[PDB]
Symmetry: C7
Subunit: 280 residues, 7 copies
């Protein structure tokens, strides 16, 4: 029992190697496994770091951002290696992994702003509330869609502007649509003076909305007195047309109204006001 005579006291049948080689070899495999973990983590960090820098230099990137992310991944793998080795050698790594988990939860609550956009993009792809050429209205901005991507949706406004809008923002609102339904409805409102005959007005409006051709006849065509107003009675007029003709139908019916009324004698009224004069 050489190690028994080298340093430790005998104290009588104290053959500590025969009953301690298990623990000694446990320490040995601990330090050797620590070495192996360190060296393997080192070489794997090098390999994966250069590999990601390569496979990122191909696609559109920035140089400083590339170096930043590559070194970030390198240091992350290095930190995992170091923590694993510390745990393997005997140090209670509970605190370092507790603060590591706190930091990870922080990063997650940070990325939450964009992971939502990614998920919403996936859902808009799989459910298809609209296609590329579809003319839509996403939360107050209306214009022909141009493309749907993973993080955002590009749509050209009717004035030529190009709006990039994030997906997570539109999936949480009313996705109105305009090319889904083929036939839609216009709504004129024609305030006239209070002395105008109602029969004549309704006759004129019915003749006008009958003479038209893009106006669908197999549906409702309303010409009713809708409201007694401050200076004028308002007539509502509702007619249906295809999604294509809508605006031109509006303009044509509107100019025909402007001509027919002035031909008949019906008068659009200026804002009226009654004054009671009294000198002082």
């Amino acid at each position: 029992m050489e190690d028994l005579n080298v340093v430790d006291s005998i104290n009588g049948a104290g053959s500590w190697l025969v009953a301690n080689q298990a623990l000694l070899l446990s320490y040995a495999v601990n330090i050797v496994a620590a070495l192996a973990i360190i060296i393997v983590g080192l070489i794997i960090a090098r390999m994966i770091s250069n590999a990601v820098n390569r496979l990122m230099i191909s696609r559109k990137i920035d140089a400083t951002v590339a170096d930043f992310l590559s070194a970030l991944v390198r240091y992350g793998i290095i930190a995992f290696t170091l923590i694993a080795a510390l745990g393997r050698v005997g140090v209670q790594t509970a605190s370092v992994i507790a603060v590591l988990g706190a930091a990870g939860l922080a990063v997650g609550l940070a990325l939450q702003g964009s992971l939502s956009n990614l998920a919403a993009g996936v859902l808009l792809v799989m459910f298809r509330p609209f296609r590329a050429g579809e003319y839509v209205d996403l939360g107050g901005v209306a214009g022909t869609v141009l493309s749907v991507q993973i993080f955002s949706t590009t749509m050209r406004t009717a004035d030529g502007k190009i709006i990039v809008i994030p997906n997570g923002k539109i999936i949480a609102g009313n996705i109105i649509n305009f090319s889904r339904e083929p036939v839609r409805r216009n709504e004129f409102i024609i305030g006239v003076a209070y002395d105008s005959d109602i029969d004549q007005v309704k006759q004129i409006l019915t003749n006008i909305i009958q003479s038209e051709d893009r106006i669908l006849k197999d549906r409702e065509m309303t010409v009713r007195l809708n409201e007694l107003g401050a200076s004028s009675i308002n007539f509502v007029v509702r007619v249906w047309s295809n999604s294509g003709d809508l605006q031109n139908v509006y303009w044509d019916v509107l100019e025909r109204i402007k001509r027919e009324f002035d031909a008949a004698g019906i008068s659009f009224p200026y804002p009226q006001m009654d004054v009671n004069f009294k000198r002082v």
Copy 2:
């Protein structure tokens, strides 16, 4: 004791195999179990990845999204396999699973935006605050419902537009309804000049709302002076009718009012203003 004479020092009755075969076999089963876990995880990842790609190619999908999700599931199973093998061989995997849990919590807080819509859809299906043809009002947008799905509700507005609205957004508001109650109430407001006799006005309005037929008589029929205003006294008129007749009753009573008043002599007043003239 061959292994005793090969490398390790004797130190006297140091028969380390006889008292260490347990730990040696523990290491052996550790590495073998690691092998088995790796190979089984590999083949299971392959099988399940091709199976999900198949069973997704049937339904409506996108090719790149299909590949993305299939490879995602493959790599997820691979990562679980790798972590399990690391833990089985002896590496403290606490840190890697801590950051994994952080990432999972991040993904959960991301999907929270749509899981809510899914749950709200389930609840609207099971409780039925409205059916398909039901004409409803969900948070400021009113129109005939068309369908109720897992993630959204489609309803055709009265103008033909088709609004897709998420479920989680309507279950958190007042779900007004219009075809639930069969009989509803109109409310006219008729401002008249300040010199008009009140008895004559109430007589006329009562005659009008008695002559009608779609007006339910077994309920309240109110014609009362409601408010002394800036240029006119306002009369409120409340009558009940079935949900179908409502709008036509409104229009008919309104035109009858417009005719009867002008027949009698009652005058709707223009906005009045009194001026005190004084030259300078």
Copy 3:
């Protein structure tokens, strides 16, 4: 020592079965317990799945939703069985249960939108801020309550509309009430011209509010000049009445005011304006 001679090397007194049967039997009970867990979880999943599908087919449900939830419960029990068996056989299931807990927290943060409504319904039931027939005002919508349920409250608006409103939304606002207090107060506001005598006006208003009978006399009855205005001085009038008579008292007093003032000579004024004329 048969197993000693079959495969493993002797190395001298290496009787590995005599000192390893404990670990061998540990492995044996591990695999057998895994088998038992799998089979028991299978049969229990089948039984409970068919039982829940039965006990749900009775109440009002949807077929696809029934199948969805039944298969969901089946797969949940199956997953718990599989994880338990993996843990029992020797695989470190820490990562799979970490991501499982992340998913569970996600589902909880999702259901948070409706669990709140459930709890608020419980509280409104146990505390009773209003009963069925009680006429209330819950956050800007006023109308007779119809029923109080676990998830929502139905109340018929004064116009016949039926509003379904979630509980969690009303318990976080001012629950005004109207049938709790038997006696309430009206408030007229009568702007008169600037030259009218104040004594005459207050005399007239006091005579009017004394002649009435539904007006409680044992409380305050206010007729005071309240404000010098742009074209008129405003008199406030406050009187008390039972919750039933309130509106009819309002209408009757209002018409009596309109008659008495025009009988006396007091004049409600049109919006006045003084102009300084100067030709150019």
Copy 4:
């Protein structure tokens, strides 16, 4: 060694009972402890369930809610018993308690809406920002408090309405008060014409606010030209009075102003406007 000869192979000095009775008895105490846990949890669930149903049937409750909560508590204790027994017998219950903790966190984030009200009620009780009869203003609603409870505060508005307002909502706003300070200040604003003498106006207003008696004299009494306006110069008037006299002081001073000005010659001006006439 009977059990040695019954089933297990000898393999030489393989006396597995002598060296395995510890583990056998461990299994035995495991299953027996499982039995004891199950039976004790059963009887305790029964006892506590009937006890809570009894002690809840006394106070104001609902029958279905009583049964719901009693069965809820029963099943909760049963689930805890089952999980404890599973853990005691050898099944890794990590996953079931992980999802249980997820569900518990969900329920907590749900109850968060009302636990806050409970805590705020405790704080309003212990700090006393107002008492029962105190006339307060809690976030835009002003009226005499009636009672303060654990979850809400009842206050009768000045119009007789009874508002129930949650505690957690008022502790997060400005708790204005009106009976805390005994003496408060009024503020008149008297726009007069642009040609009126300032000395005469200030003399009149000072005489008026000196003749009064409820107006505290030992404090500031302001009559200053405050603003040159569009059609009138505005005088501010600030006087102090006890919290009781405030409104009557306001009304009396206001009528005295209306009388004194018309006696003197000062003129309240109608909205003025200068027009430049030009024929076309």
Copy 5:
């Protein structure tokens, strides 16, 4: 070996007490330690409960709230004792402490509403953005501070009202101040007619702001044409004065302006309007 012959089967050299007294004594110390924990927790709960009820009966409290909190603390210590004893005897208490932690997190997310106010009060005490007599403006409410406490800040409004405002609400806004800076600036705006000479106006305003004495002369004194308006050109006037004189300087300069302009001939203009007359 008495216990060997009493119940358990011999099976040959099965001396189970000699090799099981360790586990038997483990069970013994388990049950005895459980007893000790229960009794000690009981007596400590009694002592601490009566002690807290005593030391709370001194300060201002409510009786029912005192009993509530004392029994709450008692039951909390009792629950901790019970859980500790269960864990000590052998029951896996993981689930009960999981739901306990869920409940604790719920209570924490509840108290979050007031812990913030406590912390903000600490910070306002240690940093002193204002003192007791300091006249401040905390988020739209301006008035002399009266006291700063742990949970709220009391400040008497300029009208005598006493506002209690929570600390956590003011530390998250702009803490304007008025007695910190000794000298401040007024700003008049004097719209005059469009035909008035600019030199005369600037001369008059400069004479006025030079004649004053509380107006600091060593700083800027601005009289510039600031804006061409709808009916008048506006002159800005900026002068500096001590925080005390500010309001009286304003009133005095304003009345001096009103007198000097009317003495000179400059005319404040009524709202002008040009009309184009045309008979029909």
Copy 6:
């Protein structure tokens, strides 16, 4: 057995060193490992603290902030060392690391406000919704971008002001753009009197928009009556031009309109009003 005779009682074959040297050496390696951890953590804290202070003194920093962060890192490493040593010696460090994790989660929820900006900056760099010279509109503020950094985006407003805007704020809104699309559209609105001939107006506007050269002819050119208004009928005019010419095209067409209309006879109308005169 010296240690057997020194202090501990014999009690018969109680050779406690021979059977306790394992535990004694466990204690020894515990205290020695604690020493090593303390000294290594000390020297590493010193080295890394001075190294970070050096490598931070180079870049732009503040002295007190440098010392603050260096001492912060030093104390952090010291605390981790202390906790590791406590765990290694035998103290249950569960509570200290629990509160440490609570503090870490607090710091993470604090930094969440800026980590989001960092991530959004990364995304704007990698996706490039705009470049340096690109003239954009980020959430209501429009102006030429100047640079894009890790935390903020600098853009010079059209008035010369320089706005620093955080990244996390713009990635959550509509990133409008103006130099992406080369050709855009103007929109004039020309209200004319009600008696003007429509044919003449449309002829004039068409001649004007044909005479121009920067107006793209291969696209739509709209001159339609768009709306009957209160005092005027409005004509819409839509023309396309390159992003460069847009504003000058607007100004030139506008002045040409102003000249051509006044040349023809078309009259822009003043706000009209009809008055009903009646003496009192």
Copy 7:
């Protein structure tokens, strides 16, 4: 074997001390280590409490707050000591540390309101979006900065008021600046009558903006008809100047405009209105 004969039954070769001294000494070191932990925690709590009270009495503090925080730290260390001792003696401290972690998370979610301000202050120091004397605009409040501290930013408004604004509030908004860019742009808007010649107006404005000297000539100088309005056509005028001259340039150009136009004959128009007279 004395302890064998004292209390425990023999049962045959039941030498429980020889085979139980390990566990007895484990209990002994448990209780002794508990003692040591208690006494060391006591003395360390005393030392650190008096030390922090001393090192806080130096800097500006409050007495009651000092005692509060010192006793808080004392009791915190005492609680950690007690929990450590309980764990060391054998009590399962899982529940107490679970509720402790819940409380810690509560305190963290409380301090989150101010930790954010601290971090934002660090970032504003290190990035320097503005310096001390820099005149900035932070979220709607504009004025010369006075100092930047760890928790707040002090800036003197242009009227002398001193606003304390928290850092976390400004780092989340548009940090406009005014002394960063040396040269900025004014923008006049001069509505003139509809009959004024455009050539004369543009000539006059160009002469005016050429005669000036602080107006940078090497940049754009715009005088264009910008809008046809209700009663006037508006001319925009854009000129550049150094950040210093800006306001004086504005005032001087404005007065020069007012003089030159009135010299030429151009007329600023009063709000126009056309009336259609008709007697009744």
